[model samples]
Target: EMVDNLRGKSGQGYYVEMTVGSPPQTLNILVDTGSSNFAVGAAPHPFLHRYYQRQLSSTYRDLRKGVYVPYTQGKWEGELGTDLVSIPHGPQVTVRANIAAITESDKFFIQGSNWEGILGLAYAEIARPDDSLEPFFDSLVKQTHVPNLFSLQLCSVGGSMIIGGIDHSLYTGSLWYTPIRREWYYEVIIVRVEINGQDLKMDCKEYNYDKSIVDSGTTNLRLPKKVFEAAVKSIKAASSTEKFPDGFWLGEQLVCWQAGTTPWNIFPVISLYLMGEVTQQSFRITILPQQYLRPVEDVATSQDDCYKFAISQSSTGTVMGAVIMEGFYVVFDRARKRIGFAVSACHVHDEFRTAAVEGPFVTLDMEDCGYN
Candidate 1:
C-alpha cells in the first residue's frame, strides 16, 4: 500500500512514513531488514531534525528496560516501551506495538537524510533483550487482518513496501522462490556465481564462506573477498576494457567519463545461482551493467560524469543488496521459509529492464549447500 510514502536518498536506503502515538506523530522510519527493532529518535541529536517527543505522546508507556544495539554502521542506546503504531500506507490498522525511543546514537544518522528512525524487519531472534520483545512487523501480522507475507520493490528514485500481502500489480511473470537457509537474517545459500554466464568454478563452500543474506540496507552487491577476486579477474579477462584503480572497485573512488558518454555497455552481466525451493535445483538471477555501474553525479569542474562500482568485497559474506534488488520485486515470505523474487514493474521498462531471473538448473553438488 506504500504508494509514494516510501522514498530514498542517493540510493542509500528506503524509508516508510508511519504514524505513532496518541494524537499520532508521523515520522519517516527506514525500512531495513538487516536488524529487528522498531526504534524512533526520542532525544535531539546532530543528525536529527525531528524526533518522537515521547513526553508529547499521551499513549507512551516507558518500561525502563535498557536496550542497546550495535550496528555494522554505528550503534544506538535507548529504553524499551510500548506505543500505538499505524502505517498510513501499510496495513492501515492501528496496533499496540513494542517500541524503542533512541536517546543516543552515533554516525548511523547521516547528513541529508530525511528519516528520523529505523524499522527493522528481520526477526524476533535478532531483537534486543532476547526474542521476548515483539517486532513491528510481528505486531502487524498478529492483527490477523493481514497475512504473514511481505514484499519489497526497490528503485533508485521510487520504491514500495507492502506488509501482510503482495500487491500483484508491483511485479510481472512468475515469482521464483528460494528457500531461506536460516531464519536469523533471511539467510540463503549461493550455489555458484557466473560472470557473463561462465560459472566461477570454486568450491560450493567458497560461495558461502559465511551465510548470505538479502539485505536491502546495503548499497552494493557485496561478495566474499575471494569470490569477488575471481569475479574481478573474470571481468578483466572477458568483459571490461577500461582499467579502473583499486579504490574504484572498492567503492572508495569514482571513475569519471566524458559528460555525454557512458561506460555501462563496457561491463558484463553478473549472475548469482541461488539454492531453490528444491535443494537439488538452483535458480540464477542476472543483473545487467547498469545495475552495478551506479552513476553518482556530473561534475562541472572536470566536465564529466562519474560512476561508483556498486559491487564490493566483504569479508563477512555475500550480500544481495540494493544494487541487485533494485531490479527485482523481492518478497520475504517468512511463513514458508522462502523468499520470492520477480521482475519489478517500476524497473521493467524496456526503457531499461536491467534484471533477469531464470533457471531450475540441476545442482552441481548433490550434497547440501549448508553453512554447517
Candidate 2:
C-alpha cells in the first residue's frame, strides 16, 4: 500500500498507516527496518480503538502461543495469530499474514502515541519466535500481486513508503545497487567512513563491515564508542571555533553545540563508503552538514535554537539511521537480495549536491587500506 510517513513528536520516529483484519481495521503503525515482527496493540493505554481487536475480525485466528517481541528499548508480549492484513495501494493489496496481538508490554514508551503498532521491514530470518512465522512483506510477496520490493523516501516534514514497486519520480540520478551482506536487517559492508577528506580511524576490522545495519526505523546514527569519539574529534578539527565553540555533551553519547548564528556551511561533510558484494566496487553516501544536527532547546540557558549532533554512540552494531537516510532515495530490493540508493528529490540542504551526478557503482578493493 502507498503509506505516507508521519513524523513523530519532536523528530522522534516515522509512522505509517495500514489496515488489518477481515473487515479492514485501520491503524497507524511505526515503520521499522531493524526488526521483523509485525505487532499491534502493545501500548498499555486507553486507546483500545486503535488496537487490533482479534475478536472483532471474523477471520482472525489465534495461534494460542505466547509471542515475545523485543526491541532496542523495550519488549512486547502477546498472542501469535493469523489475520487478513491489507495496505491501501493500487487496487488495495491484502494478504493473510502472521501478527502479534500484544497483551502485555514492558517499558513500552510509545504508549499514548499517535501510532498503534509496528510494521517491520527486515528479512524473515530475524523474525521473532524462532523466525518460523513469515512477516507481512514476505507473505504479501508470496500470496498477493505485490512485488518483492519496496522503496523509502523520508523527508524532514513527511515522506512516502511505496509497496511492491519504486516511485521513480521521488528520486533523481541512477539507482546504485549493493548486495545485502546479510538478509537479517538490510546489513551491508561499510568499507570506510571519512569526514571532509580525511578518513577516521574507525575499527573497520573489528567485524569486517558485517556489523553494519542500515535502519530507517532508527532516528540517529549509532556508532561504536571509539568510532564515535574519533568522528567527533574529526568534526571538531575540521570546523572553525567561531562556528562550533563551547559545546557540551547532551548525554553520555550526544554532543550539543552552543546557539550560534553561523550557517550550516561551516560544518564538514561526512561520507560513508559502501561496498558492492557482486561488483566488488565501493560507492559513497555523503551526509551534508545540515543533516547532522537537530535544533534543541537548552533549558538551562533558555536558548531554544541550540543544535545537537544527530549521531549517538551505541554498543549495538553500526546503525545508519534516518538522519543519514534523509538525503537519499533508499530501495530495499528483497527479491534480488540487494539494496539500492539514489539522490532523493527531497534533499534540500546538501552541501556538495553530488548525488545527482551519475557514476558507476562498484565495490572497491580496500585490501591496501587494511580493510580486509
Candidate 3:
C-alpha cells in the first residue's frame, strides 16, 4: 500500500493473532501510517450489527488487561489485550501490540472486514481528561529505538505495508533529501499556496512551512478553510455545478480550460511555498472529473454535520489524497525544530539532496492529524 512507498519499505500486510484469555484467533491487520489506533471487531454483543455474522470460537477476557480506549461518540468500552502481531518481513520476530475487544455498548463496528480490526500508526490526542492515549507510539519506540520511518502502498486490490525500514527496490529513483524534523513523526514546511499562476497574499505572521502535513488519511487538500477557499477562488470562479456527495463542486472554468488540452497538459499547475528562502515551486494536480465534486461543509462551525456532508452522501471535492504529495520529500527535523521539503521525481534517479535552511518551521505536531 501507500505505506510501503512512503516509508520506503516493502512487505505484504501482516497477520495478527488476537487472544483475550483462552482460544487464540488470527486476523489480517493493515498497518496504517495515516492514523494511530488499533482496533478489531470482537465478540458479538447487543450493539453488534446484524450484518456481522462471524462465529466466535475464541475465549474472551477483560479488555483492560493492557490499555483502555474509551469511546467518544458512542457508548462502547474496548478491552485492551496483547497480541502476537507478525509481519512477513520479520518472520522470526513478533511485535506485542494492543488489541481492543468490543463489549456491550451502542457503537457500530464494521463486519466482513475479513480481518477483525485495524492498526493505526498515525499521531493522536484523546478528549478525556484522565485518559492518556496520547503518544501511544512512545511504548513502541521504547522497545526498539529503531528510527520511526514508515512507507505505505495502499492498494484497493492487493496493497502492502512495511514498518521499521524502507524497501530500496520499490524506489524507482534515488532518495530525495530534506531536513528531518526531530519529532517522532514526519513533518513538512508549507510556504504558501500558489493559485492559477498568481501567488495569493497570506498572513505573513500565520504562514509557517511547518504546518503542512503529508497525511494519507485525509482525502482532500485540507488547509485552513478560508485559505483553501481563497486559493480555489484565485484558480477559477466557483462552478455552478455541485456534487452533493464529497464537498464543493468543480467550477466549469476548470472543465473548459482542460476540455481541449492534452492529457498531461490538462491539469492546473499548483505551487507550494517552502522554507529558508521563501521560494515557491509548481506542482501538477489533476483537475478531477465532475463526479468527484461535492458540497462543502463548514467544519469549523457545523461540528455535528461535518461528516454528514462528506460521509452520508459522498460529496464533491473528495478527490484530494496522498497522491498529491507523491513527487516530494518531507523532512521532519524535530531535533532542530524545523521541517524541510524537496521536489523530486517518483523515480530514484531524480532525487535532490541539498539542504535549504529557510523560513521558520511550523510547530504543529501529529496530534492535529489525530496522531497523539
Candidate 4:
C-alpha cells in the first residue's frame, strides 16, 4: 500500500507528502505527470533549506552524475542519487527510489512555492538521462508489493491518489479505458470538441496524431490558440453577457472573470470526445459549467475574489490538466499502457445547483487525501 496525502494549494498545484531516507524526513512534493524526474531542493532560494541530506540517510547512494530537467517556465540541474522512499500509508512500504539532489536551478517556477520538491508520475522516456534511472512509481511497481496502477481524484482544494488499485466507490459510472498512444506521456486523441451540444470546427487531420497529453501537474486546460479563441467566443456568445467584465488573461491562456456574479448559471457545458485506439470508440467527458470557472483571489488584495476560467491557449499541444479531470475519476494504468476515466462522486447535480447560486466553489464529501 503506497498512499500519499494530496494537498491542493489555492487551485494552482497539488502536493503529496513522502518520506525519504532511514529515519524518514517528510517532504511535501508536487505531483506532476508532465515530466519524470524526482528532484528535491531545486529552487534557487535560501527559504528552501530543507533538502535531502545524504549524510543523514544511511541508504543514500551517490551516482556521481548530473541531471538537467527542462520545463515550460524553467529548468532544474542537480546531482543524481538514490535513497529509500516511503509514504505514510498502509504498511509503510519503503522502496529504493532514484532522486535528484538539485545543486543549481534557473527560474524554476516551483521556487519559493509551497512544495519542496517534485514527484513525477510520467514514463521513463521523459526522465533526465543519467543511467536511465526509473521514476519512483516505476520502482514501486517492480517491487511486486502492489498492482501497477494508480488513480487520481482531484478536487478544488484537496483530493486523493490511490496507488496499486482503484476504489470503486469513488466514482459512479463505468470506467472507460483508452490505450495510450505514446509511452513518453499519457497521450490520447480528442476526436471532437463540443460546446453546449454544438461541435467546434477543428481540423481533425491536423490533430489526428496524439492530440492531447493528460497532465496532472498542470493547473489549467490548454488548447490550440485557434481552438481556444473559438471556444471563448462561443462561451461568451452563448451566455449572452456582453457586459461580462473582461478580467485579465493571466499567463498565455487563463482569462479571469469579475466576482460578485455566478457565471456557472449561464455558462454552457463543454464536452471532450476522447477516442480509444483499440476499440476505435469515443468516450465523452463532460465539463460542467461550474467546473469551468475556478475561484481565484486577487494577489494584490486577498480579500477581492474573482472567477477564472480554467481553459487556456497553448501554442502547441493540448494539455488536459487538473481542471479537466476534476469531474471524473482518472486511472493511469502503467502496466497496460492505458488510461481510464469515470464520473467521480464529486459531480453531484444537486450540489452543483446549490453552489451555483451561493458561489462557484464548493467542497465535496470525500475521505482523506493521499494513499489509502
Top-scoring candidate (TM-score): 1
Mark the 10 consecutive residues where model 2 has the least summed lDDT: 363-372
Rank all candidate structures by their lDDT, best first, as comma-separated numbers: 1, 2, 4, 3
Root-mean-square deviation per candidate: 1.9, 3.6, 10.3, 7.8
lDDT for 128 (candidate 1): 93
Ranking by TM-score: 1, 2, 4, 3
Taken over the whole model, the C-alpha lDDT of each candidate is: 0.82, 0.72, 0.37, 0.71
- Measure candidate 1: CA RMSD: 1.9
Among all windows of 10 consecutive residues in model 1, the one with the lowest summed lDDT is 346-355
| Range of the 10 consecutive residues with the lowest summed lDDT in candidate 4 | 354-363
lDDT tens per residue, model 3, 60-105: 3333543334422133455555443444343233445555554444
- Listed in order, each prediction's TM-score against the native is 0.94, 0.86, 0.54, 0.85
What is the lDDT, from 0 to 100, of the residue 27 in candidate 3? 47
Error in Å for residue 370 of model 1: 1.8
How far residue 76's Cα lies from its native spot in candidate 1, in Å, is: 1.2
Off by over 4 Å in 2: 1-7, 42-49, 89-91, 201-203, 206-210, 240-262, 277-280, 296-303, 350-372
Error of 3 at 68 (Å): 8.2
What is the C-alpha RMSD, rounded to one decimal, of candidate 4?
7.8
Candidate 1: what lDDT?
0.82
Q: Which regions of candidate 3 fall more than 4 Å away from where they truly are?
A: 1-24, 44-77, 89-92, 104-116, 123-141, 144-147, 154-160, 172-188, 204-212, 237-266, 274-372
